[PDB]
Design a protein around this ligand. Sequence first.
Ligand SMILES: *[C@@H]1O[C@H](CO)[C@@H](O[C@@H]2O[C@H](CO)[C@@H](O)[C@H](O)[C@H]2NC(C)=O)[C@H](O)[C@H]1NC(C)=O
Ligand SMILES: *[C@@H]1O[C@H](CO)[C@@H](O[C@@H]2O[C@H](CO)[C@@H](O)[C@H](O)[C@H]2NC(C)=O)[C@H](O)[C@H]1NC(C)=O
Ligand SMILES: *[C@@H]1O[C@H](CO)[C@@H](O[C@@H]2O[C@H](CO)[C@@H](O)[C@H](O)[C@H]2NC(C)=O)[C@H](O)[C@H]1NC(C)=O
Ligand SMILES: *[C@@H]1O[C@H](CO)[C@@H](O[C@@H]2O[C@H](CO)[C@@H](O)[C@H](O)[C@H]2NC(C)=O)[C@H](O)[C@H]1NC(C)=O
Ligand SMILES: *[C@@H]1O[C@H](CO)[C@@H](O[C@@H]2O[C@H](CO)[C@@H](O)[C@H](O)[C@H]2NC(C)=O)[C@H](O)[C@H]1NC(C)=O
Ligand SMILES: *[C@@H]1O[C@H](CO)[C@@H](O[C@@H]2O[C@H](CO)[C@@H](O)[C@H](O)[C@H]2NC(C)=O)[C@H](O)[C@H]1NC(C)=O
Ligand SMILES: *[C@@H]1O[C@H](CO)[C@@H](O)[C@H](O)[C@H]1NC(C)=O
Ligand SMILES: *[C@@H]1O[C@H](CO)[C@@H](O)[C@H](O)[C@H]1NC(C)=O
Ligand SMILES: *[C@@H]1O[C@H](CO)[C@@H](O)[C@H](O)[C@H]1NC(C)=O
Ligand SMILES: *[C@@H]1O[C@H](CO)[C@@H](O)[C@H](O)[C@H]1NC(C)=O
Ligand SMILES: *[C@@H]1O[C@H](CO)[C@@H](O)[C@H](O)[C@H]1NC(C)=O
Ligand SMILES: *[C@@H]1O[C@H](CO)[C@@H](O)[C@H](O)[C@H]1NC(C)=O
Ligand SMILES: *[C@@H]1O[C@H](CO)[C@@H](O)[C@H](O)[C@H]1NC(C)=O
Ligand SMILES: *[C@@H]1O[C@H](CO)[C@@H](O)[C@H](O)[C@H]1NC(C)=O
Lengths: 244, 370, 34, 50, 49, 86, 99, 50, 36
Amino acid sequence: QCVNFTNRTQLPSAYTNSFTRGVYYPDKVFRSSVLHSTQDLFLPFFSNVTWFHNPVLPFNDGVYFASTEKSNIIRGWIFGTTLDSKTQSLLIVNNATNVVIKVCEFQFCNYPFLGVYYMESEFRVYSSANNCTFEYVSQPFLKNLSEFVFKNIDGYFKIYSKHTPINLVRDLPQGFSALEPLVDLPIGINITRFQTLLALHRSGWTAGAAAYYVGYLQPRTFLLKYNENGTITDAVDCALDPLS
Amino acid sequence: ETKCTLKSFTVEKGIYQTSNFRVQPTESIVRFPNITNLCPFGEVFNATRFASVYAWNRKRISNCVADYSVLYNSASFSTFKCYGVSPTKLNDLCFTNVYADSFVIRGDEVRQIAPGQTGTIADYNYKLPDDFTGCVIAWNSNNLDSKVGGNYNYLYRLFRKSNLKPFERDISTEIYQAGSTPCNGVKGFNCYFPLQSYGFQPTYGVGYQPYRVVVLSFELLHAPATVCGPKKSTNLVKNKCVNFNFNGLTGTGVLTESNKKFLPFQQFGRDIADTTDAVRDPQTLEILDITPCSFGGVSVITPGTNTSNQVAVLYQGVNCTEVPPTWRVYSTGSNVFQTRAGCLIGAEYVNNSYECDIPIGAGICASYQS
Amino acid sequence: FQTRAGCLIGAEYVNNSYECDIPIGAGICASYQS
Amino acid sequence: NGLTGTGVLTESNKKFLPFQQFGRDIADTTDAVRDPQTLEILDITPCSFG
Amino acid sequence: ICGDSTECSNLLLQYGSFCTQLNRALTGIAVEQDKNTQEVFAQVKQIYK
Amino acid sequence: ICGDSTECSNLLLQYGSFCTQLNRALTGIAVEQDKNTQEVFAQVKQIYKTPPIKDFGGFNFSQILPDPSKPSKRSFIEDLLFNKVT
Amino acid sequence: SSTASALGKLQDVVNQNAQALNTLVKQLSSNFGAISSVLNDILSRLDPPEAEVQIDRLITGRLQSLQTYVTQQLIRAAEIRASANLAAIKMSECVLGQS
Amino acid sequence: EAEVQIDRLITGRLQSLQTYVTQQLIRAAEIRASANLAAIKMSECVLGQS
Amino acid sequence: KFNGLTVLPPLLTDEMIAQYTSALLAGTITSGWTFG
Ligand SMILES: *[C@@H]1O[C@H](CO)[C@@H](O[C@@H]2O[C@H](CO)[C@@H](O)[C@H](O)[C@H]2NC(C)=O)[C@H](O)[C@H]1NC(C)=O
Ligand SMILES: *[C@@H]1O[C@H](CO)[C@@H](O[C@@H]2O[C@H](CO)[C@@H](O)[C@H](O)[C@H]2NC(C)=O)[C@H](O)[C@H]1NC(C)=O
Ligand SMILES: *[C@@H]1O[C@H](CO)[C@@H](O[C@@H]2O[C@H](CO)[C@@H](O)[C@H](O)[C@H]2NC(C)=O)[C@H](O)[C@H]1NC(C)=O
Ligand SMILES: *[C@@H]1O[C@H](CO)[C@@H](O[C@@H]2O[C@H](CO)[C@@H](O)[C@H](O)[C@H]2NC(C)=O)[C@H](O)[C@H]1NC(C)=O
Ligand SMILES: *[C@@H]1O[C@H](CO)[C@@H](O[C@@H]2O[C@H](CO)[C@@H](O)[C@H](O)[C@H]2NC(C)=O)[C@H](O)[C@H]1NC(C)=O
Ligand SMILES: *[C@@H]1O[C@H](CO)[C@@H](O[C@@H]2O[C@H](CO)[C@@H](O)[C@H](O)[C@H]2NC(C)=O)[C@H](O)[C@H]1NC(C)=O
Ligand SMILES: *[C@@H]1O[C@H](CO)[C@@H](O)[C@H](O)[C@H]1NC(C)=O
Ligand SMILES: *[C@@H]1O[C@H](CO)[C@@H](O)[C@H](O)[C@H]1NC(C)=O
Ligand SMILES: *[C@@H]1O[C@H](CO)[C@@H](O)[C@H](O)[C@H]1NC(C)=O
Ligand SMILES: *[C@@H]1O[C@H](CO)[C@@H](O)[C@H](O)[C@H]1NC(C)=O
Ligand SMILES: *[C@@H]1O[C@H](CO)[C@@H](O)[C@H](O)[C@H]1NC(C)=O
Ligand SMILES: *[C@@H]1O[C@H](CO)[C@@H](O)[C@H](O)[C@H]1NC(C)=O
Ligand SMILES: *[C@@H]1O[C@H](CO)[C@@H](O)[C@H](O)[C@H]1NC(C)=O
Ligand SMILES: *[C@@H]1O[C@H](CO)[C@@H](O)[C@H](O)[C@H]1NC(C)=O
């Protein structure tokens, strides 16, 4: 139950500085007051970050997704290669209740969205879901800056997350905040592209304040500092400058 | 002891280092998670239908307790070959992410299933990594996977552009440009279909019949353990040098109520060079810290065997509160003293001060009058 | 700047002469005023 | 001709007797190779590092 | 000990950090040489003529 | 090199007596250090004391002589030296 | 009192000794070609006829590391002894008389 | 099986390198002693009568 | 520079060594020992 549109929305993709965001805890080992050097896939410092005000974007190795979100307009995520019934696809939705994660051979049309009724009762993202392999339910994920990191390594889909109170207008904050791991999924797909999902106010769609920041990951070596409480407070990117 | 360690029947006045002492542990403890449910192995082995080598079937197993004794003691398996572990030790290891890859092969290629091997299926259908850890199971299936008229549902690929990366499956059934002549979707000449079936008939002798083969692949200490063997947990005791086995992690030391705080997702902690300082117990989910029970070096002070035979014993850097080499003779009632160097037994401290003969350390030194 | 020790980038060569702070080699060394 | 190595190849004026195939100087390090086809004497220098 | 070979480097990687301390010792003696010469000769504060 | 294991010790004992000389060298080093300090400092036979009244023609040694007030019984410069270096 | 870094030699000695101990300790974490850098695991994972091989590899690696450490210590001790001998001469000559 | 031969070559070359480094250390110590003597001689005999 | 060897130049050039020797010698000819 999905139809096309006439208002061909075109998001004005601008560019911004990455600053020093996108650092997460790499392992499950506690460490206190120590400088540890580790090599892994990270977001390099001071890189370009694309700003979108829903194009199909390539996944590459992994994705850093940020949103200075208000009222939580963003709902879900789509992952796959062709986003059709010919290949396995991953879907994530986060409504006012527990999240839903599915890995199935969906049938995605041109404009997938949730839809809200005014008491919400609407779900018309796709058209068919024949073969399903994995399902998952847990706590809901979501003025405020929400950061997520998606990785796909060794048949494991890692999703890390963090929430921060922010008050700056547009630019990404100049500060440091580690990312605690959120969930690991033991499912193997060959994802190469992804999308985003919006809950447009269906009563004519009115979803224009849909801004999100996208950045990509590269493999490199970092130096991390753990304080006495085991919290990462500082990091140094090795391959950035002679000083580094 | 000093005579024996110095290889002489006489010893001169001085101080000699003989050996070290350690506190022996007792009451070994095994602590495993509470998750207990039979792990589904039979249906993998007793499956009616298997898959061709180019489409080998994979199953992921986790959150179960596994009994490998039924597999090991059964003689139905012609080849039971384990590489990184011993078959008899499999009932005492905890680990995650069990992988079971099942298929059926030609009888003569069974020894191509090994790390660092070259063959037809070894490089075009299924290649194992060099550092593979796990086991392989091979057993004949003449009575089932062979037909008198000849079954041909079992396929294998002979032509490919290049080799295969370890743990990779290819199901691309496309014509291959065998020669310089292009195919353009038509076989013609110098082009052949990569896949062909097997001529399995009961008429063939040994080494020709189909063999059902399944490989089990493991991981070693890279996650919170999810699969464990048939072992019984016990209670924990603190403040005593004991042997402990936490979820396959073996060690020896004393356990204490730790003060450090863990975020809700770690499992343990370390400081420098694989020194596991803290551990979370799998059942009670209570943090503890581990420190090895006391040890030290022992030295003797003797005035020379030509003069007398009395000796004094110094335990270096050890608190005198606990001391009892057995040598219970110097543990009953002999005079004891505590100095910054350690604990001294057999010598008495005197307020008189004058130059000494046998230095001890930290300004303390001893001599023969007793 | 090209010198006997090697190729030096990021620092400018001058015609003065002071004491030696951070030795470089072949008779030359560098310092902070750039 | 089976002798493998990495370097930069220049022209050389050294003279080989008609039966050698490659030269060396000391500590057993190759320095000059006669190419099989044009029968000329080349010179090998390790490309720069530091 | 490797001569620009990837597998040789990988195999050497698991031998620890012998090379770090080797280079450290060589650098130490190299610095000591210059310190030695400067100590021997630089005995004056000016340059008389 | 064994970490309190019997099998490691059994395999090690067939390597000969390396550890005897390994310990011997370190013991020699320690004894040498003690001798070094003893011969550098113990140049005198007695322990002299300064007189209670100090009139050294105008020279002022208060910064160098030990301070009885401090429990450490060390002078000012010695305290500075001890504090500066770890 | 004010200017620091005036005691470079003593600090250098302390740093050298501490760094030597640190690298000696850190050497315990290398595989040296075996399957694991922890000995209890390989004892508790496979049958002795090859545990002996793995322990052989660990033993030879750790022996080499220990020998290197001892030799470095010997060289440094000789140098320090020379310095202390010079200091003794200086105290004997300049403190106890006019030079 | 190529890894075994590679390992043998690696250990041999590493041992040779260690031997060279140790020899260098000994020689440097000797030279340092000689240069200390030279500095003392230059200070005591050139800058004054001994 | 063959297969990893590198020779580093000394910090003091031979000209500077000559200058120190000349300074010492010209000082000791004229001043005596007082310049030390
Ligand atoms: C789920 O996947 C199976 C396995 O591919 C699908 O079954 C195949 O469907 C195609 C479609 O024409 C057939 O050509 C194949 O013969 C079928 N079997 C196999 C083994 O591939 C199935 O259609 C998918 N969907 C559902 C709802 O089951
Ligand atoms: C590390 O954890 C400790 C333990 O809570 C923190 O100490 C508390 O800090 C707050 C904020 O200053 C104080 O109100 C509490 O009184 C402190 N606790 C105690 C027991 O004094 C500490 O702030 C954390 N961070 C750092 C950097 O130490
Ligand atoms: C596959 O099924 C057979 C029979 O269904 C299992 O055979 C068992 O063999 C053991 C040892 O001889 C007996 O104690 C059991 O009683 C047998 N099972 C039954 C149901 O009688 C065989 O073990 C199964 N395969 C696996 C891998 O479990
Ligand atoms: C050996 O252990 C005893 C028992 O803990 C120590 O005695 C305590 O020492 C602390 C100071 O280190 C005092 O505050 C306590 O009052 C002492 N008595 C107790 C705790 O009952 C003793 O100091 C230890 N020996 C050494 C050399 O540290
Ligand atoms: C090997 O190299 C080429 C291969 O064809 C040939 O060399 C040329 O031969 C033509 C024919 O006489 C000459 O005109 C050229 O001058 C040759 N070139 C060179 C570089 O010698 C020939 O077959 C062989 N040449 C030699 C020297 O063995
Ligand atoms: C030697 O010098 C010290 C350092 O100044 C003198 O100690 C000071 O004495 C004056 C007057 O008694 C006090 O006001 C200062 O507070 C003292 N300074 C310190 C750091 O104690 C000392 O008096 C001098 N010796 C003599 C004999 O006068
Ligand atoms: C049409 O799309 C633009 C681009 O997002 C949006 O700003 C505008 O509100 C939309 N108008 C309507 C009527 O939907
Ligand atoms: C990357 O950042 C630079 C620097 O601002 C900018 O000029 C460029 O347009 C950005 N995007 C790409 C694709 O280079
Ligand atoms: C939406 O909320 C309802 C409320 O129970 C429930 O179906 C689930 O939590 C959510 N559904 C999906 C598809 O996310
Ligand atoms: C922002 O997030 C914090 C915690 O993540 C939450 O308490 C707060 O209500 C959020 N603010 C809004 C406007 O949703
Ligand atoms: C095992 O049993 C104890 C006591 O009944 C219980 O507290 C614990 O939660 C159980 N284990 C798990 C994983 O729930
Ligand atoms: C023991 O000492 C006595 C007295 O000095 C001496 O006469 C005797 O020879 C010594 N014996 C030995 C074995 O040293
Ligand atoms: C000196 O002897 C007295 C005996 O009354 C004793 O109490 C005291 O501890 C002694 N002093 C020392 C330093 O042992
Ligand atoms: C330094 O002086 C030389 C000659 O006096 C001249 O060639 C050169 O350009 C000068 N360089 C600078 C930076 O002044």
